[PDB]
Amino acid sequence: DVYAQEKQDFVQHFSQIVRVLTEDEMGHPEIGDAIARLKEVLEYNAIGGKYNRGLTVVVAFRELVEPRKQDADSLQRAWTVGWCVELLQAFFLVADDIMDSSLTRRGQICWYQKPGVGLDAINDANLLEACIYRLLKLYCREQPYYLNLIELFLQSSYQTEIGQTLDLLTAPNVDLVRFTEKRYKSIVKYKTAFYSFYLPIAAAMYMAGIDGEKEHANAKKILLEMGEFFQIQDDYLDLFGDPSVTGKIGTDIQDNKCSWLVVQCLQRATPEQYQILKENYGQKEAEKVARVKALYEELDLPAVFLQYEEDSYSHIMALIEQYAAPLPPAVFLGLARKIYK
Amino acid sequence: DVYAQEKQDFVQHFSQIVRVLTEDEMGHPEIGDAIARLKEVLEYNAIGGKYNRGLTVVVAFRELVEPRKQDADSLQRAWTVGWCVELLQAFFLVADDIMDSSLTRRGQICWYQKPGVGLDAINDANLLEACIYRLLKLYCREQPYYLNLIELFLQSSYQTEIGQTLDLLTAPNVDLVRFTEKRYKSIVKYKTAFYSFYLPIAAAMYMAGIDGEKEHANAKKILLEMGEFFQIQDDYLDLFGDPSVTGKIGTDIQDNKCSWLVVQCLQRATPEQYQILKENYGQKEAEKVARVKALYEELDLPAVFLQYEEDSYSHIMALIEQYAAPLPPAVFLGLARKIYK
Numbered sequence: 001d002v003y004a005q006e007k008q009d010f011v012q013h014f015s016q017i018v019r020v021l022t023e024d025e026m027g028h029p030e031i032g033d034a035i036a037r038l039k040e041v042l043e044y045n046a047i048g049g050k051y052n053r054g055l056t057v058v059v060a061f062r063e064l065v066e067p068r069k070q071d072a073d074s075l076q077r078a079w080t081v082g083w084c085v086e087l088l089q090a091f092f093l094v095a096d097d098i099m100d101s102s103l104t105r106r107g108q109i110c111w112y113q114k115p116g117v118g119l120d121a122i123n124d125a126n127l128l129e130a131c132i133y134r135l136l137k138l139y140c141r142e143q144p145y146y147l148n149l150i151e152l153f154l155q156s157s158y159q160t161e162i163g164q165t166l167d168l169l170t171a172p173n174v175d176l177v178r179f180t181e182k183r184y185k186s187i188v189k190y191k192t193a194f195y196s197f198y199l200p201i202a203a204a205m206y207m208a209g210i211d212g213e214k215e216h217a218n219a220k221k222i223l224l225e226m227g228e229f230f231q232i233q234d235d236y237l238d239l240f241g242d243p244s245v246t247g248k249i250g251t252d253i254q255d256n257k258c259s260w261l262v263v264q265c266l267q268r269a270t271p272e273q274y275q276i277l278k279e280n281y282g283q284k285e286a287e288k289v290a291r292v293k294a295l296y297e298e299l300d301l302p303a304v305f306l307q308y309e310e311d312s313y314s315h316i317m318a319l320i321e322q323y324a325a326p327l328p329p330a331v332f333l334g335l336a337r338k339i340y341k
Numbered sequence: 342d343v344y345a346q347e348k349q350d351f352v353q354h355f356s357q358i359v360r361v362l363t364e365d366e367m368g369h370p371e372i373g374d375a376i377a378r379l380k381e382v383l384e385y386n387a388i389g390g391k392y393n394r395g396l397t398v399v400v401a402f403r404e405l406v407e408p409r410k411q412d413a414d415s416l417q418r419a420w421t422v423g424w425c426v427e428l429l430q431a432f433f434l435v436a437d438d439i440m441d442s443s444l445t446r447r448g449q450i451c452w453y454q455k456p457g458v459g460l461d462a463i464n465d466a467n468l469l470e471a472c473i474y475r476l477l478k479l480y481c482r483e484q485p486y487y488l489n490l491i492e493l494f495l496q497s498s499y500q501t502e503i504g505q506t507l508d509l510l511t512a513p514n515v516d517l518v519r520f521t522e523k524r525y526k527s528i529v530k531y532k533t534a535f536y537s538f539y540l541p542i543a544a545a546m547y548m549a550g551i552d553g554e555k556e557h558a559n560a561k562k563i564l565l566e567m568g569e570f571f572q573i574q575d576d577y578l579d580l581f582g583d584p585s586v587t588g589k590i591g592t593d594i595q596d597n598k599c600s601w602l603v604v605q606c607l608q609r610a611t612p613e614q615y616q617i618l619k620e621n622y623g624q625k626e627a628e629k630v631a632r633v634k635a636l637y638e639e640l641d642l643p644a645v646f647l648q649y650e651e652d653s654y655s656h657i658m659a660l661i662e663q664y665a666a667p668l669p670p671a672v673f674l675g676l677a678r679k680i681y682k
């Protein structure tokens with residue numbers, strides 16, 4: 001895996017990221033204590049995932065730039081912009097965990113639940129966001145793609161926050177008339193797909209001098225469709241995934257989520273089934289969760305999913321055929337491989 | 342007051358700000374509901390203050406640009422960038438009110454305390470921040486100062502968040518050994534002074550083509566000192582201000598704040614007085630608040646303040662004399678007039 005290869009160098013760079021972000025403690029004694037807390041926030045929240053989004057920046061950059069133009073400095077910058085994607089993500093998650101009242105994340109206590117953090121985590125989340133722009137300036141300010149990357153990260157933030165707003169309005173209070181296919185697809189596009197799939201490839205593209213609006217729009221069309229499939233599979237696996245394979249155990253039903261599953265169930269159910277759903281969806285008690293799952297099985301949603309997975313795979317391959325050029329198809333196929341596996 | 346003059350046109354522009362931010366509902370039906378919530382967030386949180394910071398952008402712009410170069414479009418842009426300062430502020434306050442567990446703000450129920458908002462206000466705060474960059478792009482993207490303003494707002498955000506972190510570490514848990522003059526001045530500089538005083542003049546300067554680092558640094562030296570005095574007076578007035586004149590009633594002592602007053606008190610008190618402070622500071626009960634106030638009076642802190650106000654006034658005037666050029670002194674004197682009144 002081209003991801004397994006760059007991974008070591010990527011995680012190693014994190015040390016440098018932290019050092020440079022905290023080096024103002026050398027210019028500004030007065031803020032020492034705050035900079036110490038920033039360092040703690042970075043190490044607890046930016047480390048510990050799989051880094052797929054950040055690494056995607058580095059892999060794509062290596063495929064898109066002639067080897068002649070990939071000097072030590074070029075690659076410092078790619079590792080930094082990859083880490084900027086991971087910091088964006090850490091900003092979203094710290095804030096989301098507060099808003100959802102989550103306990104754990106990535107098999108750890110959520111930052112805001114830590115003794116002595118609490119709602120101070122809101123400012124901590126904001127600093128994680130701010131760090132992105134500190135890093136872009138420190139590493140990329142003299143580059144022709146500087147302003148392109150600032151605007152891409154700011155737009156990625158807005159799209160994701162819009163998606164969150166839509167999600168919060170949809171899944172406050174237990175209600176299913178909200179849980180439509182058009183609304184589900186909208187949430188996924190704004191809240192997940194733009195920042196997870198479009199943003200890291202887009203960033204690599206700008207870094208490689210590929211700034212044309214048509215090329216960005218072509219890549220976007222492939223990448224938002226990949227993001228849609230990725231979330232749908234995530235929603236499917238939450239309930240039907242082996243938890244020792246996926247690393248989560250699902251609470252979508254307990255948590256009244258607008259999951260792909262419940263959207264499909266509502267398209268398919270009878271009035272009687274609607275009731276079994278309405279009576280059981282979004283309860284803590286486990287017998288209520290068994291009865292939602294059972295209804296999903298009665299309606300063969302696993303079969304529906306596998307069908308959707310196959311269709312989705314043809315469609316993505318067609319999209320790559322038609323819209324990849326002039327990027328190397330491998331940019332898109334490497335992603336497709338990671339998620340349809 | 343040059344502020345009273347521009348004020349009508351400034352508040353009138355808000356309608357247009359909202360219209361343009363919500364006009365994507367015309368490109369993107371799917372996100373209609375989210376855009377409706379954005380509109381509600383903007384109207385509840387961006388309206389209702391005195392707009393001193395935003396208006397400062399417009400007044401300074403009018404003093405700094407030859408009248409020949411102040412066309413209808415120039416002024417649209419100045420009103421927009423003024424509103425960007427007010428949106429930055431609304432982002433800070435919505436988030437701060439959550440973190441402090443405040444009930445009211447500007448004589449209204451805090452947004453997050455509204456039925457059905459709660460911690461969703463965190464995402465609402467983030468959208469207010471995002472709106473800044475939407476507006477800069479929509480109104481200023483073709484301008485030579487575009488990237489200058491993006492960087493100024495992003496830096497203003499970082500400085501303020503750093504200041505918040507320092508504040509949160511200083512005033513968590515009741516403790517006064519933290520409450521030193523050096524720490525107080527650091528909090529004020531980062532958390533208040535950069536965004537309240539430097540940011541709006543700086544923005545006007547870039548808009549006028551004044552981008553030199555020395556000119557920005559000269560203006561900064563005056564403006565951070567003005568910001569320091571403004572907070573100290575705010576801290577003084579909280580306890581000794583007529584509330585029907587100031588529009589607040591003070592809770593600095595109840596809330597364990599690192600207020601200028603308690604910093605001065607700790608420099609001056611005996612071991613016995615320290616104890617009276619320690620036993621009473623940061624309690625709800627009113628007899629405990631009367632006894633802090635009484636100690637401040639025993640130590641003539643009002644006299645100390647008036648002395649500090651006079652000194653601070655000489656010093657600011659000296660700074661204007663020495664560092665204003667080549668800006669018109671009136672840029673600085675208009676501010677000084679608003680706050681030493």
Ligand SMILES: Cc1ccc(-c2cc3c(N[C@H](Cc4cccc(F)c4)P(=O)(O)O)ncnc3s2)cc1Cl
Binds near residue numbers: 230
């Ligand atoms: C751009 C991008 C974004 C995300 C991913 C992947 C995430 C992921 C993954 N993520 C976990 C969450 C998860 C767990 C099971 C299935 C699933 F789709 C996602 P976590 O965020 O805890 O590392 N787990 C297993 N395989 C993959 S592949 C891969 C790419 Cl190429």
Ligand SMILES: Cc1ccc(-c2cc3c(N[C@H](Cc4cccc(F)c4)P(=O)(O)O)ncnc3s2)cc1Cl
Binds near residue numbers: 306309313336341
């Ligand atoms: C770019 C790309 C994308 C996907 C794949 C493959 C996916 C896959 C595969 N995917 C399964 C999903 C699946 C199962 C049945 C039909 C279908 F189209 C897709 P799973 O994620 O369950 O391992 N199963 C067996 N072989 C392969 S080969 C291989 C490549 Cl090179």
Ligand SMILES: Cc1ccc(-c2cc3c(N[C@H](Cc4cccc(F)c4)P(=O)(O)O)ncnc3s2)cc1Cl
Binds near residue numbers: 390571574578587676
């Ligand atoms: C750049 C800038 C920033 C703030 C101000 C002022 C704020 C202010 C003011 N602000 C109120 C808060 C307050 C209330 C009493 C004293 C004080 F210093 C500040 P609010 O934020 O509720 O409008 N009240 C009375 N006079 C003034 S003058 C003036 C300028 Cl030039």
Ligand SMILES: Cc1ccc(-c2cc3c(N[C@H](Cc4cccc(F)c4)P(=O)(O)O)ncnc3s2)cc1Cl
Binds near residue numbers: 681682
């Ligand atoms: C640029 C500027 C700045 C401040 C002032 C004035 C402040 C002031 C003034 N300030 C009082 C504060 C004060 C009270 C005594 C001495 C002192 F230096 C300052 P307050 O805010 O209590 O009205 N009191 C009486 N006259 C004036 S004139 C006038 C101008 Cl033009």
Ligand SMILES: [Cl-]
Binds near residue numbers: 073074
């Ligand atoms: Cl270089």
Ligand SMILES: [Cl-]
């Ligand atoms: Cl888009």
Ligand SMILES: [Cl-]
Binds near residue numbers: 414415
């Ligand atoms: Cl024009």
Ligand SMILES: [Cl-]
């Ligand atoms: Cl500074």
